[PDB]
Design an enzyme around this catalytic site. Structure first.
Site, PDB file in Angstrom:
ATOM      1  N   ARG A   1       0.812  -1.212   0.000  1.00  0.00           N
ATOM      2  CA  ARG A   1       0.000   0.000   0.000  1.00  0.00           C
ATOM      3  C   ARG A   1       0.846   1.262   0.000  1.00  0.00           C
ATOM      4  O   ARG A   1       0.417   2.294  -0.527  1.00  0.00           O
ATOM      5  CB  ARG A   1      -0.932   0.026   1.206  1.00  0.00           C
ATOM      6  CG  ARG A   1      -2.013  -1.009   1.176  1.00  0.00           C
ATOM      7  CD  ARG A   1      -3.096  -0.689   0.187  1.00  0.00           C
ATOM      8  NE  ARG A   1      -4.156  -1.691   0.220  1.00  0.00           N
ATOM      9  CZ  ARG A   1      -4.161  -2.795  -0.519  1.00  0.00           C
ATOM     10  NH1 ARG A   1      -3.159  -3.042  -1.349  1.00  0.00           N
ATOM     11  NH2 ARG A   1      -5.167  -3.651  -0.426  1.00  0.00           N
TER      12      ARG A   1
HETATM   13  N1  LIG Z   1      -4.780   5.540  -9.433  1.00  0.00           N
HETATM   14  C1  LIG Z   1      -3.735   4.778  -9.037  1.00  0.00           C
HETATM   15  N2  LIG Z   1      -2.486   5.007  -9.492  1.00  0.00           N
HETATM   16  C2  LIG Z   1      -1.444   4.252  -9.109  1.00  0.00           C
HETATM   17  N3  LIG Z   1      -1.549   3.219  -8.260  1.00  0.00           N
HETATM   18  C3  LIG Z   1      -2.744   2.879  -7.730  1.00  0.00           C
HETATM   19  C4  LIG Z   1      -3.929   3.656  -8.100  1.00  0.00           C
HETATM   20  N4  LIG Z   1      -4.967   3.114  -7.449  1.00  0.00           N
HETATM   21  C5  LIG Z   1      -4.491   2.082  -6.717  1.00  0.00           C
HETATM   22  N5  LIG Z   1      -3.172   1.940  -6.891  1.00  0.00           N
HETATM   23  C6  LIG Z   1      -2.338   0.919  -6.240  1.00  0.00           C
HETATM   24  O1  LIG Z   1      -3.183  -0.034  -5.597  1.00  0.00           O
HETATM   25  C7  LIG Z   1      -2.825  -0.161  -4.224  1.00  0.00           C
HETATM   26  C8  LIG Z   1      -4.050  -0.425  -3.360  1.00  0.00           C
HETATM   27  O2  LIG Z   1      -5.157   0.373  -3.758  1.00  0.00           O
HETATM   28  P1  LIG Z   1      -6.371   0.599  -2.735  1.00  0.00           P
HETATM   29  O3  LIG Z   1      -6.999   1.938  -2.998  1.00  0.00           O
HETATM   30  O4  LIG Z   1      -5.892   0.234  -1.359  1.00  0.00           O
HETATM   31  O5  LIG Z   1      -7.397  -0.539  -3.205  1.00  0.00           O
HETATM   32  P2  LIG Z   1      -8.329  -1.299  -2.145  1.00  0.00           P
HETATM   33  O6  LIG Z   1      -8.816  -0.207  -1.230  1.00  0.00           O
HETATM   34  O7  LIG Z   1      -9.394  -1.919  -3.007  1.00  0.00           O
HETATM   35  O8  LIG Z   1      -7.410  -2.294  -1.491  1.00  0.00           O
HETATM   36  C9  LIG Z   1      -2.130   1.133  -3.857  1.00  0.00           C
HETATM   37  O9  LIG Z   1      -1.051   0.891  -2.967  1.00  0.00           O
HETATM   38  C10 LIG Z   1      -1.571   1.643  -5.157  1.00  0.00           C
HETATM   39  O10 LIG Z   1      -0.189   1.294  -5.249  1.00  0.00           O
END
Ligand SMILES: Nc1ncnc2c1ncn2[C@@H]1O[C@H](COP(=O)(O)OP(=O)(O)O)[C@@H](O)[C@H]1O
Ligand SMILES: Nc1ncnc2c1ncn2[C@@H]1O[C@H](COP(=O)(O)OP(=O)(O)OP(=O)(O)O)[C@@H](O)[C@H]1O
Ligand SMILES: [Mg+2]
Ligand SMILES: [Mg+2]
Lengths: 523, 539
Positions: A390
């Site tokens: 993350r």
């Molecule tokens: N728009 C984005 N650009 C780059 N990386 C992203 C993006 N969205 C998500 N990620 C990658 O996905 C990982 C987890 O996303 P997250 O928002 O925690 O999804 P969820 O909440 O469904 O687990 C982040 O650490 C990031 O590295």
């Protein structure tokens, strides 16, 4: 049949008394004829109704709390879990063969607690707090509850400090943070305990180099493992010196199901001492999928209704309230941190299991260890398309952040090409070139076991592959070419790169200077 | 007057009353407990006993502990006093800034808005995300589902939706953190302290967001009811204040998950795969309150975690019908490096209608979906033949759809701190023309990778310039770069001399601050009179 005439019967309506004055003077001489068969009545103590398979149903115990330590008259401890209306369901912290029907149960007054403090630093402990290493009782230690609520929103702060693990696949692609929960998940014998162990060894190597406040105290919780494995791990941690900073909580397979259920909470309570006193902790819950199995057994024998794969309904809360205790506190709470490494074993690579999906949804990152990458020589078997973290940036080495982006991109270039490796048309010498660099990167990322690398010698080694300096060698000797790189580049580069954190513009100059000054044996 | 605790099994407490039982969904206080423990009446057991779910941990409860009835459900503060505050499931301030000075505390339980007070207008909520605003356009006053597994970018997408919509909305927003990580709740709270959405101290009233948090460390009773607390804050902001409200709910899946953890202890035999029998009606009773009435409006954004990337799991499959728009995030799209990982086909909206958004926007969205479905059908024969014989009609629809796939990606403002690239806001008429040009064929001369992680169509034709300048480099390699020491750089040993040496203590600080109390070797029990005695040596 309803309660209104049933309460009217509380008013006397006998209208005759030709049995009442007869048997009231006949009752007490009858009861005294059997007073050696009577057991004495019980109100605030307890008495075992039924015992079996590690569960005692205890009559009495009027003022017990839920989750409270009790103690049977045979000395073995217990835990009052479900307080029903006519009995208390007590799980037994040990072998329940010393418990009989009619045994007295004593309430101890305490919710379940373990000894926490600096005295645990170096001991081998069971899942309840007693030392099992044969070095006497715990000294310089204090008792603390195993059911502390995790610190909230205002108590935490953002995860910034790295806590390197010494595994350059991890520290290059899945960078850990110092208060971050990172799940190591894979099949059996795919190297999960190896990654956690090399992390602990690297904290030993870094604790003798940093000034007293970035020092990391590891806590290893061995749930459900056999005792030979735990003894081999204690021998490893003593023969490398890692036992000076490591606590080991060991509820083995021979232990009771509540001991293995409670041992991650015991290890987290022992590791929260360093988090709450401004130091930095590292907690490894090895085989969290065995703690879930012990919890399943413990709750099924309490006759709670089963769910998915006969697990309890609240088996998500079991791991969520455990893993949420790994935090990075604010400056007014000391700034201390605790980073979790839970381990889940999957079955035939099935990531869609119940406990596996729950702990994936709980933790921050993931470290996937595939058994087909393991047998292709890639050790550690990091699944680079599935291992996520993350934090990404702002939790790794600033020198590694400049270098590993060109690694993260070019491994993705390698993976989308290698699904066309049945034909070999080698399109415009570009699809040939990107696999001829990605194979070098995957062979670069391999390393040995029980030998962690400092972060400067990792970000020099990826510097020699994201740039040129290795395009002249075959892919069969890059594990020796990087040994030639680290062994023959002058060790004053590593001191400057550690003291800077990034590559200064005077340092990438000297690093490009000395990566042609060395003789790599790749021919 | 009061009742007593009859039975504690997990997070479910049975309370027995002697006459005048409380109603279902009533709130009960437990006194004698260390922390404030609130029980909500789930059902009547039948012999003057109610069965409850707890809002905090039941560790410590004694059979016979006095439980008092409140005569009302869980009441929480609502109004302007909650703006810029973090609340519990039961409305306590957990931001450690005084009490919550809001008038007219409201129950978290009410019925849905009835059928006649339902709005029918459809205006497009422009977000600035060129995969959202093109293919599955959101509706202001509508309900939005952010589907997707663990790690695909639900929280990053809802952060970017906050950072785009909720700052330029005027009205109040409500964030409901239902069963998520406390770390990202602290991240949202900090990132709205700095961006000025939440203000502290005397200027607290100029805040535009109310936080209600029910995160993963909470018991399953506190995660099952925290969505109702965020929803009743938004319902006060919609009905009484008349405002247009934003209601961001992070992981509405955890509502159904929290109701599943207690349903076996409530006496319900399980349904399909392991959820409660009351899954669809609990989700409907929650979600039908999130509507746009005639009084005000609630624009709800909802993340839905699908378990193990299964869209056929019944907890998101029930959620699918209650939504106006739907943004399915896919793991295979994020494995291509494309962010946001929106499935361009599986995402759906009610606004994708030529009578609503216009026959230019609708036709270019249908054309983008047509060429992407054509490429998905060609992806089979590409991996067996090799994309060399397709006679320039199927070889063009591969390159155009690949430019469209890269053009759907977008750098986020909230993703600068783990990608580095600055974020982009792409407007609606500015993405319709940009996708119409790559659809009709105005940008086949551009390189294919130039569409990746840019903003407008006036950024791909500049990344083409920078790419053709950067491949115009790497041409000559004689000398005169940084490695020759004669320019400005010292020796390697002199840079060592610029290092400040740090102290090493080698004592770790473990002997000066610890209250090393003494623990008894023997075990200490309590006898019948409650006195503390040693364990009696007679087994
Ligand atoms: N728009 C984005 N650009 C780059 N990386 C992203 C993006 N969205 C998500 N990620 C990658 O996905 C990982 C987890 O996303 P997250 O928002 O925690 O999804 P969820 O909440 O469904 O687990 C982040 O650490 C990031 O590295
Ligand atoms: N980096 C490595 N290099 C070489 N061998 C390794 C490496 N990592 C692990 N191994 C080997 O893989 C085997 C399995 O290691 P490990 O015990 O860490 O996996 P595990 O998943 O914990 O196994 P189990 O599921 O049985 O607990 C060990 O015998 C070890 O020697
Ligand atoms: Mg193992
Ligand atoms: Mg999330």
């Amino acid at each position: 049949a309803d309660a209104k005439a049933l309460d009217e019967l509380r008013k006397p309506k006998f209208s005759s008394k030709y049995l009442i004055q007869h048997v009231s003077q006949k009752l007490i001489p009858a009861v005294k004829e059997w007073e050696k068969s009577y057991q004495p009545p019980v109100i605030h103590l307890g008495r075992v109704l039924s015992v079996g398979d590690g569960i005692a149903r205890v009559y009495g115990l009027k003022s017990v709390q839920a989750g409270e330590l009790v103690c049977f008259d045979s000395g073995v401890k217990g835990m009052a879990l479900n307080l029903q209306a006519d009995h208390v369901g007590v799980v037994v912290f040990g072998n329940d063969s010393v418990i009989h029907q009619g045994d007295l149960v004593y309430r101890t007054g305490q919710i379940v607690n373990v000894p926490i403090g600096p005295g645990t630093l170096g001991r081998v402990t069971d899942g309840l707090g007693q030392p099992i290493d044969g070095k006497g009782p715990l000294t310089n230690v204090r008792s603390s509850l195993v059911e502390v609520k995790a610190p909230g929103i205002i108590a935490r702060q953002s995860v910034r400090e790295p806590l390197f693990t010494g595994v350059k696949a991890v520290d290059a692609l899945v960078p850990i943070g110092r208060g971050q929960r990172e799940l190591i998940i894979g099949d059996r014998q795919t190297g999960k305990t190896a990654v956690a162990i090399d992390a602990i060894i690297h904290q030993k190597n870094c604790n003798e180099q940093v000034p007293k406040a970035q020092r990391v105290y590891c806590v290893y919780v061995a749930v459900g493992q056999k005792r030979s494995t735990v003894a081999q791990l204690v021998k490893l941690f003593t023969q490398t010196g890692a036992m000076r900073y490591t606590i080991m909580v060991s509820a083995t397979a021979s232990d009771a199901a509540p001991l293995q259920f409670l041992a991650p909470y015991s290890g987290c309570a022992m590791a929260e001492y360093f988090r709450d006193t401004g130091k930095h902790g590292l907690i490894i819950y090895d085989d969290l999928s065995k703690q879930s199995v012990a919890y399943r057994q413990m709750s099924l024998l309490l006759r709670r209704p089963p769910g998915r794969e006969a697990f309890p309904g609240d088996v998500f809360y079991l791991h969520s309230r455990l893993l949420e205790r790994a935090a990075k506190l604010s400056k007014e709470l000391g700034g201390g941190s605790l980073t979790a490494f839970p381990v889940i074993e999957t079955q035939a690579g099935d990531v869609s299991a119940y406990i596996a999906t729950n702990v994936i949804s709980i933790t921050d990152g993931q470290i996937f260890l595939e058994t087909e990458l393991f047998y292709k020589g890639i050790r550690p078997a990091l699944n680079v398309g599935l291992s996520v973290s993350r934090v990404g940036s702002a939790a790794q080495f600033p020198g590694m952040k400049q270098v590993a982006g060109t690694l993260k991109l070019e491994l993705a270039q390698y993976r989308e090409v290698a699904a066309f490796a049945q034909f070999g048309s080698d399109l415009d010498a570009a699809t040939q070139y990107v696999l001829e660099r990605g194979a070098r990167l995957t062979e670069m990322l391999k390393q040995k076991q029980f030998a962690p690398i400092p972060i400067e010698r990792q970000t020099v080694a990826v510097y020699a592959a994201t740039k040129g300096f290795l395009d002249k060698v075959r892919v069969q000797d890059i594990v020796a070419a990087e040994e030639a790189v680290i062994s023959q580049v002058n060790p004053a580069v590593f001191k400057i790169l550690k003291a800077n954190g990034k590559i200064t513009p005077a340092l990438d100059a000297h690093l490009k200077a000395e990566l042609r000054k060395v003789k790599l044996p790749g021919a | 007057d009061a009742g007593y605790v009859s039975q504690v099994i997990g997070p479910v407490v049975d309370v027995r009353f002697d006459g005048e039982l409380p109603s279902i969904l009533s709130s009960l206080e437990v006194e004698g407990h260390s922390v404030r423990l609130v029980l909500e009446v789930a059902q009547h057991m039948g012999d003057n006993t109610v069965r409850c779910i707890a809002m905090d941990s039941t560790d410590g409860l004694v059979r016979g502990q006095k439980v008092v009835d409140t005569g009302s459900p869980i009441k929480v503060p609502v109004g302007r006093g909650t703006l810029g505050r973090i609340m519990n499931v039961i409305g306590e301030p957990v931001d450690e800034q005084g009490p919550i000075d809001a008038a007219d505390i409201w129950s978290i339980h009410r019925e849905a808005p009835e059928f006649t007070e339902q709005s029918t207008e459809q205006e497009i909520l422009v977000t600035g995300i060129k995969v959202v605003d093109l293919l599955a356009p959101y509706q202001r006053g509508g309900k939005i589902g952010l589907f997707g597994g663990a790690g695909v970018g639900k929280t990053v997408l809802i952060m970017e939706l906050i950072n785009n919509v909720a700052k330029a909305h005027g009205g109040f927003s409500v964030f409901a953190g239902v069963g998520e990580r406390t770390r990202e709740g602290n991240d949202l709270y900090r990132e709205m302290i700095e961006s000025g959405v939440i203000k502290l101290g005397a200027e607290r009233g100029n805040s535009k967001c109310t936080l209600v948090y029910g995160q993963m460390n909470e018991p399953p009773g506190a995660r099952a009811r925290v969505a109702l607390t965020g929803l009743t804050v938004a319902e006060y902001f919609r009905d009484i204040e008349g405002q247009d409200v934003l209601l961001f709910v992070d992981n509405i899946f955890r509502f159904t998950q929290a109701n599943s953890e207690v349903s076996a202890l409530l006496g319900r035999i399980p349904s399909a795969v392991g959820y409660q029998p009351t899954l669809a009606t609990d989700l409907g009773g929650l979600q039908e309150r999130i509507t746009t009435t005639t009084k005000g409006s609630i624009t709800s954004v909802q993340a839905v975690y699908v378990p193990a990337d299964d869209l056929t799991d019944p907890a998101p499959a029930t959620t699918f019908a209650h939504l106006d728009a739907t943004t399915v995030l896919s793991r295979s799209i994020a494995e291509l490096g494309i962010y946001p990982a929106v499935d361009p086909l599986d995402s759906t909206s009610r606004m994708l209608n030529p009578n609503v958004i216009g026959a230019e926007h609708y036709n270019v969205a249908r054309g983008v979906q047509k060429v992407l479905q054509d490429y998905k059908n060609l992806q089979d024969i590409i991996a067996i033949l090799g994309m060399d014989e397709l006679s320039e009609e199927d070889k063009l629809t591969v390159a155009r759809a690949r430019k469209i796939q890269r053009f759907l990606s977008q750098p986020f403002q909230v993703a600068e701190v783990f990608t580095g690239t600055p974020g982009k806001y792409v407007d609606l008429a500015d993405t319709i023309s940009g996708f119409q040009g790559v659809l009709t064929g105005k940008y086949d001369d551009l390189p294919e990778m130039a569409f990746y992680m840019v903003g407008d169509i006036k950024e791909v034709k500049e990344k083409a310039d920078k790419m053709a300048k950067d491949i115009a480099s790497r041409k000559e390699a004689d000398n005169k770069k940084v490695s020759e020491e004669l320019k400005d750089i010292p020796s390697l040993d002199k840079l060592v001399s610029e290092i400040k040496e740090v102290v090493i203590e080698e004592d770790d600080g473990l002997e000066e601050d610890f209250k090393a109390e003494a623990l008894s070797s023997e075990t200490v029990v309590l006898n019948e009179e409650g006195k503390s005695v040693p364990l009696p040596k007679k087994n």
